[PDB]
């Protein structure tokens, strides 16, 4: 039983990606202090305990599922598509999410507001003519006050429906006060859609749409995500635990039940001695 760890994560042979102050979802959405993570790829995304959010206060229904599938995809490669939003103002921003010196927003999301004094029923489409899945991350804005709702979106209650040939997903934004987070009582709700090859995406919204700017190229592979504060190191190891890399020469380990790579099996025993000699009968 391998019961001790070196305390550091070996950066080979696995493509480790240390996420400094960024969670996977924050790097996905395009949080300003996560701009260095654009188009990154990883075999293991190491997510530090010190990570924090510093943008518009959002919320991900089924957060675990999105984090899991993004981690499994193993890439943040974002392809910008040409979406045509007619009759609305694009590139909305806020002072809660300060990019540069001025107001900003998530870099992978487009905050569409009314243009002039109208907000048409957006109805856009994108076909998936490529042979890979596309991941679209969109949002719904929940304003704090009805005045804000009508000031941003002329409708008194918008809705957002994102649909494909096989599935559809509709959100009715609500207006209500919420706990004060970074100076705002309004929220973003983050939803995702996967467009399989040969399928179509239709976005139909009459208000409260945080539209996508493109798609994340989905992949299949040996990628995952780990929560660990262990520091990365220049060394070779096939088995990574939150406690660092451990040698996989022994068949069992007692370090952590969370593992990645060619790891030993986790057992509850701290020691198991295998006899490699004969009965020991000493003199006298």
């Amino acid at each position, epitope marked *: 039983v391998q019961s001790s760890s070196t*305390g550091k994560i070996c950066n080979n042979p696995h493509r480790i990606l240390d996420g400094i102050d960024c969670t996977l979802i924050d790097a996905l959405l395009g949080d300003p202090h996560c701009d260095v993570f654009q188009n990154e790829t990883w075999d293991l995304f190491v997510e530090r*305990s010190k990570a924090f959010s510093n943008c518009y206060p959002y919320d991900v229904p089924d957060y675990a599922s999105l984090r899991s599938l993004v981690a499994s995809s193993g890439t943040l490669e974002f392809i910008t598509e040409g979406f045509t939003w007619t009759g609305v103002t694009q590139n909305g921003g806020s002072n809660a999410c300060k990019r540069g010196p001025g107001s900003g927003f998530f870099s992978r999301l487009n905050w569409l507001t009314k243009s002039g004094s109208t907000y048409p029923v957006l109805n856009v489409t994108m076909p998936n003519n490529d042979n890979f899945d596309k991941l679209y991350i969109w949002g719904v804005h929940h304003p704090s006050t009805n005045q804000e709702q009508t000031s941003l979106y002329v409708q008194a209650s918008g809705r957002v429906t994102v649909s494909t040939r096989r599935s559809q997903q509709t959100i009715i934004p609500n207006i209500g006060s919420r706990p004060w987070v970074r100076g705002l009582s309004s929220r973003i709700s983050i939803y995702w859609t996967i467009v399989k090859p040969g399928d179509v995406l239709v976005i139909n919204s009459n208000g409260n749409l945080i539209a996508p700017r493109g798609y994340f190229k989905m992949r299949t592979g040996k990628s995952s995500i780990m929560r660990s*504060d*262990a*520091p990365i190191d220049t060394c070779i190891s096939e088995c990574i635990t939150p*406690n660092g890399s451990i040698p996989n020469d022994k068949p069992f380990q007692n370090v952590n039940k969370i593992t990645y790579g060619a790891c030993p099996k986790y057992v509850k025993q701290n020691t198991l001695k295998l006899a490699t000699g004969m009965r020991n009968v000493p003199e006298k």
Partner: antibody, heavy 126, light 97 residues
């Protein structure tokens, strides 16, 4: 802005117990571990102990084992260090310093104390 | 582990000061200005944190790390500690006219 704000100066009597507090601001207490470091007046820094916020496991020096207790009140982003059976030699300035690792590793092995509090002058003597 | 350190280097403004530490086993260098909480000056024996001038530097060779301050100003005079848990003895940097 990240800030650690400590209690006021305490004047105690030998044999008593004292409780120093450290209120964190600008970050979440459970994101970082917290070390406690004493400095006798003009005798250099001395590592007292370490609290692992988010799971509560401690590590004190053998010199302080049994007579120092560290806790975290996560509701108020506060950490407390109480020293029981105060001696005269315990007159010192106590600092709470922020250390990085809390998950997978004990932070103070691999990370520095990048943010310090102003320290409280616990004087047990006269 | 035991840390050792060369104490009380008296230097003039504008010069270079070298402070040593010999870890017997991650060393970090802290500065305590007079009447102020200690400050992190370098981590990882080489890395400098945010906010410190580039004149501070660190160098690890084997089991002996050293901290170099170049063109030191008035605010650099303080007491310097190495840390690895255990601290160093301390090294006072005075000003010399």
């Amino acid at each position: 802005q990240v800030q650690l704000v400590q209690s006021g100066a305490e004047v105690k009597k030998p044999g008593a117990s004292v409780t120093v507090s450290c209120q964190v601001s600008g970050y979440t207490l459970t994101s970082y571990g917290l070390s406690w470091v004493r400095q006798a007046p003009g005798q250099g820094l001395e590592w007292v102990g370490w609290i692992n916020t988010y799971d509560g496991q401690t590590k004190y020096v053998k010199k302080f084992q049994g007579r120092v207790t560290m806790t975290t009140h996560t509701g108020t982003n506060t950490a407390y260090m109480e020293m029981k059976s105060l001696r005269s030699d315990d007159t010192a300035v106590y600092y709470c310093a922020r250390v990085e690792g809390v998950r997978g590793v004990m932070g103070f092995h691999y990370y520095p104390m990048d943010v310090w509090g102003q320290g409280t002058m616990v004087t047990v003597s006269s | 582990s035991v840390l050792t350190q060369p104490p009380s280097v008296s230097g003039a403004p504008g010069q270079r000061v070298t402070i040593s530490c010999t870890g017997s086993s991650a060393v970090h260098w802290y500065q305590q200005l007079p009447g102020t909480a200690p400050k992190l000056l370098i981590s990882g024996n080489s890395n400098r944190p945010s906010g410190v001038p580039d004149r501070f530097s660190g160098s690890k060779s084997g089991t002996s790390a050293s901290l170099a301050i170049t063109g030191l100003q008035a605010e650099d005079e303080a007491d310097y500690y190495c840390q690895s848990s255990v601290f160093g003895g301390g090294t006072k940097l005075t000003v010399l006219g």
